[PDB]
Design an enzyme around this catalytic site. Structure first.
Site, PDB file in Angstrom:
ATOM      1  N   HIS B  41       0.815  -1.199   0.000  1.00  0.00           N
ATOM      2  CA  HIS B  41       0.000   0.000   0.000  1.00  0.00           C
ATOM      3  C   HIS B  41       0.870   1.281   0.000  1.00  0.00           C
ATOM      4  O   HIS B  41       0.307   2.375  -0.028  1.00  0.00           O
ATOM      5  CB  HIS B  41      -1.086  -0.015   1.073  1.00  0.00           C
ATOM      6  CG  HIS B  41      -0.604   0.220   2.464  1.00  0.00           C
ATOM      7  ND1 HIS B  41      -0.417  -0.824   3.342  1.00  0.00           N
ATOM      8  CD2 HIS B  41      -0.338   1.385   3.098  1.00  0.00           C
ATOM      9  CE1 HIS B  41      -0.012  -0.268   4.474  1.00  0.00           C
ATOM     10  NE2 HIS B  41       0.067   1.059   4.369  1.00  0.00           N
ATOM     11  N   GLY B 143       2.568   6.570   9.417  1.00  0.00           N
ATOM     12  CA  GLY B 143       3.883   6.334   8.838  1.00  0.00           C
ATOM     13  C   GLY B 143       4.643   5.167   9.444  1.00  0.00           C
ATOM     14  O   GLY B 143       5.783   4.911   9.040  1.00  0.00           O
ATOM     15  N   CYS B 145       3.758   1.969   9.180  1.00  0.00           N
ATOM     16  CA  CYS B 145       3.685   0.797   8.329  1.00  0.00           C
ATOM     17  C   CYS B 145       5.031   0.461   7.723  1.00  0.00           C
ATOM     18  O   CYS B 145       5.820   1.358   7.434  1.00  0.00           O
ATOM     19  CB  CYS B 145       2.581   0.923   7.285  1.00  0.00           C
ATOM     20  SG  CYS B 145       0.932   0.647   7.969  1.00  0.00           S
TER      21      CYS B 145
HETATM   22  C1  LIG Z   1       0.088   2.234   7.482  1.00  0.00           C
HETATM   23  O1  LIG Z   1       0.432   2.787   6.222  1.00  0.00           O
HETATM   24  C2  LIG Z   1       0.455   3.213   8.590  1.00  0.00           C
HETATM   25  O2  LIG Z   1       1.536   3.738   8.769  1.00  0.00           O
HETATM   26  N1  LIG Z   1      -0.679   3.441   9.330  1.00  0.00           N
HETATM   27  C3  LIG Z   1      -0.724   4.301  10.508  1.00  0.00           C
HETATM   28  C4  LIG Z   1      -1.017   3.548  11.763  1.00  0.00           C
HETATM   29  N2  LIG Z   1      -1.422   4.212  12.889  1.00  0.00           N
HETATM   30  C5  LIG Z   1      -1.541   3.247  13.733  1.00  0.00           C
HETATM   31  O3  LIG Z   1      -1.256   2.052  13.243  1.00  0.00           O
HETATM   32  N3  LIG Z   1      -0.903   2.262  11.901  1.00  0.00           N
HETATM   33  C6  LIG Z   1      -1.777   2.761   8.794  1.00  0.00           C
HETATM   34  C7  LIG Z   1      -3.096   2.733   9.239  1.00  0.00           C
HETATM   35  C8  LIG Z   1      -4.048   2.069   8.482  1.00  0.00           C
HETATM   36  C9  LIG Z   1      -3.666   1.454   7.299  1.00  0.00           C
HETATM   37 BR1  LIG Z   1      -4.991   0.623   6.218  1.00  0.00          BR
HETATM   38  C10 LIG Z   1      -2.353   1.451   6.866  1.00  0.00           C
HETATM   39  C11 LIG Z   1      -1.398   2.099   7.635  1.00  0.00           C
END
Ligand SMILES: *[C@]1(O)C(=O)N(Cc2ncon2)c2ccc(Br)cc21
Ligand SMILES: *[C@]1(O)C(=O)N(Cc2ncon2)c2ccc(Br)cc21
Lengths: 304, 304
Positions: B41, B143, B145
């Site tokens: 993603h 950020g 992920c």
């Molecule tokens: C992922 O790209 C990312 O960094 N986050 C932020 C996050 N906040 C808490 O846990 N992760 C995220 C959220 C939701 C998705 Br579908 C992808 C990501």
């Protein structure tokens, strides 16, 4: 989302761990530039520890009696000196992995990461707090002495602790990187007792702010209090008294959540008086005091 | 002495963190040899996340659209492919800091360390467990992920998790390093609910053994039980059922303490039925389930 007991990334400190042996005693050392820092009791046998005279025991030691091994290679010791409870071994090679660093003497209530080591090799990393009685509740076994505690600001490692001792109660004691013990402890195998381990009030408040930021809000009450009234309750529950300096450092958390510091104090006061009633805050069934207000800000803002 | 929630030393993993940017999206990547692994993603905008077709979105991407930065220097991308939910970016330079490594898909109940990262930079390290509902209770912000979970055996890093998602309840979901999600989750901004987060019974027992080794023995009762009787109670309290495989892995802890596994089960059964009565075990007011029997052995024996 979520809130964890988080340690600093330990790589910068792993690159400094060495093994120091003097006779039959082996401990951990910290190699920064061309100096290896280690507990002075690396010179003691088990019998010496019962009642050591370190200056006298050091008369029988030359540079060649300290064996320093970095990874699987031997460093040449070209000088040695005792500073308080640490030995400083000058080696002929500067540590190529020396990070930017400082030596800091922390205050009770301050948290730090510990890289637990054995034979100069890291086994794990965990988060500690300097207790108000100047002990730490670590996780250390035989040969752990010389493991260090630290904080990191961007690329600078501030070393604040070196492990030197285990009290007969299983709590731990040690020094800053200048060899001065935190609290009244001495590097001797003699029974030493700790004072009252009070709760670090400013840290509990910071963690209640972290709970509100992460959605755990059941404990928020409809009350406020004053510093004096709160401190009467804090004293009754063996909590550290709260000062205007502590209120000041909670300012950003108060601003982010819109909950005045004294309102959070009143909510904490009710939690002390009522207990948790089987409920949890941030997955804990007790009030957590090993997150400082800076730790909460760092974790809730994503500082790297 | 002492028992802590301890993470693995993170240096070996810090040396693998990179930043990956595709258009205006920036995430973390893991650089091992000449490949950078990251959540697929990274190719999505916020709008794409609501309903992505990754194969279609990938048609518009060439090697030069993925910007990989290691420290403050740019890596040249010479190939890219999608494997399940991860992208693999072939770079022209092997990571000089690549540790010995494996990719492992862990089972529910298994713990691991997470090196939380932002912009390819480590912010902290903490210990997690793969919950029985295949979520993890991490501490992640925007950020994060691409941050990975891992275990270390001496000098070999076994990567088991990459962070991909946050559920609307604030719990987290992700994949193994082959891009397969743990549990039924999908990398999409659609509401996904988690199943019952049961307690990892074998881990609670291991932690009760750690408590006995460290002196906390108040909970040891005068009873024994059977696997079937214990499991009736475990099911009533939303604890995972205990199998003879779990009894087997507790064997060394049973041997060290002289407390038969089924005796510890009976003590746990009484704790579930009676509660803690305001008491704590290893400084916790609840039963801890994020230490596996191997974690307890490692910590109590000093493995490096
Ligand atoms: C992922 O790209 C990312 O960094 N986050 C932020 C996050 N906040 C808490 O846990 N992760 C995220 C959220 C939701 C998705 Br579908 C992808 C990501
Ligand atoms: C120090 O040399 C050391 O490694 N240990 C072992 C230990 N076990 C738990 O905490 N530390 C130790 C104990 C007591 C003293 Br006086 C020194 C040391």
């Amino acid at each position: 989302s979520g809130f964890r007991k988080m340690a600093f990334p330990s790589g910068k400190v792993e690159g400094c761990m060495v093994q120091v042996t003097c006779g039959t005693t082996t401990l951990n050392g910290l190699w920064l530039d061309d100096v290896v820092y280690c507990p002075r009791h690396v010179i003691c046998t088990s019998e010496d520890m019962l009642n050591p005279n370190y200056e006298d025991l050091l008369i029988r030691k030359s540079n060649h009696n300290f064996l320093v091994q970095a990874g699987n290679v031997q460093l040449r010791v070209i000088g040695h000196s005792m500073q308080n409870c640490v030995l400083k071994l000058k080696v002929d090679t500067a540590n190529p992995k020396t990070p930017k660093y400082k030596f800091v003497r922390i205050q009770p209530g301050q948290t730090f990461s510990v890289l637990a080591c054995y034979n100069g090799s890291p086994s794990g990393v965990y988060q500690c707090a300097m207790r108000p009685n100047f002990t730490i509740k670590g996780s250390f076994l035989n040969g752990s002495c010389g493991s260090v505690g630290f904080n990191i600001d961007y690329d600078c490692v501030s070393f604040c602790y070196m492990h030197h001792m285990e009290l007969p109660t299983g709590v731990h004691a040690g020094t800053d990187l200048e060899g001065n013990f935190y609290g009244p402890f001495v590097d001797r195998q003699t029974a030493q007792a700790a004072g009252t381990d009070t709760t670090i009030t400013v840290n509990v408040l910071a963690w209640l702010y972290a709970a509100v930021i992460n959605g755990d809000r059941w404990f928020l009450n409809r009350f406020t209090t004053t510093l004096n009234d709160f401190n009467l309750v804090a004293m009754k529950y063996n909590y550290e008294p709260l000062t205007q300096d502590h209120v000041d450092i909670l300012g950003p958390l108060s601003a982010q959540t819109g909950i005045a510091v004294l309102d959070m104090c009143a909510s904490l006061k009710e939690l002390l008086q009522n207990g948790m009633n089987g409920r949890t805050i941030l997955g804990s069934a007790l009030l957590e005091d090993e997150f400082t207000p800076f730790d909460v800000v760092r974790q809730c803002s994503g500082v790297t």
